[model samples]
Target: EDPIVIVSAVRTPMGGFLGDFKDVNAATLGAAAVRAAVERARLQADEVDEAVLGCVLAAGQGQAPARQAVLGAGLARGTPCSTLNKMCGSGMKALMLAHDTLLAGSAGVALAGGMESMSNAPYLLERARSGYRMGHGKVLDHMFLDGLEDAYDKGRLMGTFAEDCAEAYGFTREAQDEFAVASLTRAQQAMRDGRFQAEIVPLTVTAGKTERLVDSDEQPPKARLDKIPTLKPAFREGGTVTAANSSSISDGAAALVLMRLSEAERRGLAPLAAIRGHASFADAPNLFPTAPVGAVKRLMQRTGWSLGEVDLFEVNEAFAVVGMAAMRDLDLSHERLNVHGGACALGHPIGASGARIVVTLLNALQQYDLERGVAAVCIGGGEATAIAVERL
Candidate 1:
């Protein structure tokens, strides 16, 4: 079997909720990342054999969001495309599928990633299909209903599950807040040092007949840690999960150009990293935050790469407790985890986060001249996906 390798990885700067990317749609954001990655890889548009994108909120995004992205990215219209949704794990799942396709010899080159525009998630009218003859009809926020709410338990939010994980892991609110502050601080320092410049593709957005460049993440600069302790619990009474520590709803996209190692060598492309292995695991519906532990363990078992072998890690910070629980269960080192910050500071653009983490991990490996890294994301449906990559 041919080893799949990433030649280029890029992501749009995460835009805060209703912020710089509010006017942009998911497909457009995805196109930006796709086009930038392909360009960076120095590949012709027709060279792409397939494209896969993960998008969680597809209510008003029209048919085949991935197809839209492929066309918008100027890839050949004949290129095969697919859009997948695995909640927060969507992006990583897309990469895993792309890897499988490459391994199956079905595609010589593949583009895979995730995208989301929470700012533009439409309000859904559930009763619109049926005749609404009564008084007031309930309008659902598609972002919350499809992206943030638990599928098995309708009334419970993802934040509530974070609280559960916090309580179960004995993570205190102060500790979580401190974690949040650290994330913010790391992100701020990274941005100041231009550490993310290579991985980020600047996006030019139009607003009111004027254009502006969105070259940096929108959340970190606006984050204020002083009031984090004073903030009220967002999910439950006396809960540790709060808005300050929880991942923010945001908009962004991330993409990578992948090909077999032999193909990359033949093309004289210096690959960023070779994909070692990937795995997905699930537990009880409500215990989603710690699912990364199971997924990472399975990945290690499959890849035969022990925890000590991994030089870096990117565990998506859906909430502070998610990281806390995974670190406790997996015995992962905080110093090697999310070294440049994570979703808690940079913002979690749901569908985009899975791919974002992988992109960031590869970049981090390159930035630090590391050997190997593991990237993992906890999904909303009590599941998590993990991927291991060896820097080339």
Candidate 2:
């Protein structure tokens, strides 16, 4: 199979829970990122061979949100599109599918990414066989039921799983809080230094009677690092995982343009990085948050590389404890891990976070003059995916 290379990647500025992006739907954000990525790759909309979008909550939106994004981006009518759902790993899964498509000669110049609007996840009602009843009723939030919540554990929250991992891994509450503070601090520094501005496309949004441009990430939880540790645990009593240390509900989108390396070079498209290896694995459902630990281990085995080979590691901060545990399992140091903040500080919009991390990882590789990088994301169902990339 031919190697796949990334041409360009871009993401919308992430908005906090019901913050600036509350009114925006997933399709609009997805379209904006897609259009920007296509233009940045110097490819016409019509030239896109296919588009694969990862989305977790697809209830409110009509069928194939990926196609909706394509039309919203003004792509040609016949451009193929598909939607994938691998929980939080959907976005990275989309990228994996696009790479396989190019290798199999199904298409070239594909666009792949993930988008989600937790604000629009919607509430759903269940129908009882006894018609409309006043006493027997339930309103399920799709964001909670589908976007989060482990399928195997109905009564437990995801944060509880992280708490268990923290206990097993000996991650103290203070340690998790300290790590969370560092993530926020790094993110704030990156934001102030204009590090994120380059990859973030300016989003024009309207709220109430005001219309404005959002060109940078809104990071306050990290800016005020001293207050993060004071927050209480979210899932259980005496738990290490706190709301402040966990990933936030957000609305955002991200896309990457990819093609075979030879084709990119032949077409004069400058390649950013090449896909070296990719893999996915599943472990005990109860220990879901820490599944990425096994994923990186498997990826290292498949790539036949040592931990020292990967200078840049972009593991999603589903929870601060998860990051700390996975790094410990992988025997990684703080210096080479999430150099610029992760989902904890940046805001995780479910599906969008998978692709978002890759975009951030590649940028960090170039910024630090590094070579190989490993990006991993854990799903809700005890499954995780990992990808290895080398700068071209």
Candidate 3:
């Protein structure tokens, strides 16, 4: 059976550091977004068949948070929920899996997306205890896994994917600076003009006994551009990718409600957007962050839709190079690209990025009253997720 793609999607405002959402865990943020997504699509929480959430780093409190999120958001106990981990592509990948499953007649209604609280990343020790060695200096690990990259990635953060793209594709530091500037400008515009108001819902965290609801996008003022973040390259020295050019380690959640055209027609639900098609591709594990290039090529071929037809593009800015690589391969236009900025400026919340990009992409399309848009991004360990979305 032909799989029906995503229909409605929503994501919370990308929060920098702990900031307002500091007390919130992955599950709470995820649940709030999922609940809002249901409301956005005008679907009842009880009517959902299942919800799939993505998380790249399952550390500390995030372990199995997806289940917690589904129930916490007021979904029925009978509703099935699953968690997916595909690094940056977690949410979109889960949606893809759900799409296939639901289209096969296995489900009635479904919600799938992702969330991440990188600020709450945990520290782990590999050799904590031994029979003979009680005082061993154990190896430490964060959410990032070993062998994702070669020796260079050992004990190193994953932002280097962007640095790699910069070095390999000759993306200059100056170009990165310009792009970074553009992202902030766009994001600021979204925040001021209430572009994100519809999808980014307010939430109050119940951390311990404190109840704090953060409603606005935690935007860094535009005046701070002069005080540029130190140029910390993810990979090679003198590389173009830098802290300013890459996504900040952020905390947030996102969700999407997907149903078939027939299902929507029957239910009379107003789909924010219709999911046309979604495709995932893989490559060499370490080099997997560039999989979106492959995904885009294959997606275009699968749908037989020319590059010109896509009215907008939401290529995750996991690293500037990732976007640069895909843009080079396709007919990319600044006008058709991410209109509300991207991860480089907004921050990357691991699993949530997948759904986040899709939601933002759709919003851009709607804002311009455009006809079609594409959301795609590279992920860890040779994975990528690509999709086409359009107005209902």
Best by TM-score: 1
List per-prediction Cα lDDT, in the order shown.
Answer: 0.93, 0.87, 0.76
TM-score to native of every candidate shown = 0.98, 0.97, 0.91
lDDT of 3 by residue, 192-242 (tens): 898887767788767687776777667544226775545555566766666
Candidate 2: give the clashing pairs: none
TM-score for predicted model 2 compared with the true structure: 0.97
Per-residue lDDT tens digits for candidate 1, residues 1-392, read 55899999999999999999999999999999999999999998899998989999998999999999889989988889999999999999999999999999899999999999999899988889976788998789999888889878885798988988888888998999998999999999999999999999999999899999999999999987778999999999988889999999999999999999999999999999999999999999799999999999999999999998999989999999988887888888889999999999999999989999999899889988999999999998899999999976
Clash totals for all models, in order? 0, 0, 0
| Superposed model 2: Cα runs more than 4 Å off | 128-134, 220-223
Poorest stretch of ten by lDDT in candidate 2 = 218-227
Global lDDT of model 2: 0.87
- What is candidate 2's lDDT per residue for 139-184, written digit by digit as tens? 7898988877877778567888888888888898889888888888
Clashes of 1: 0
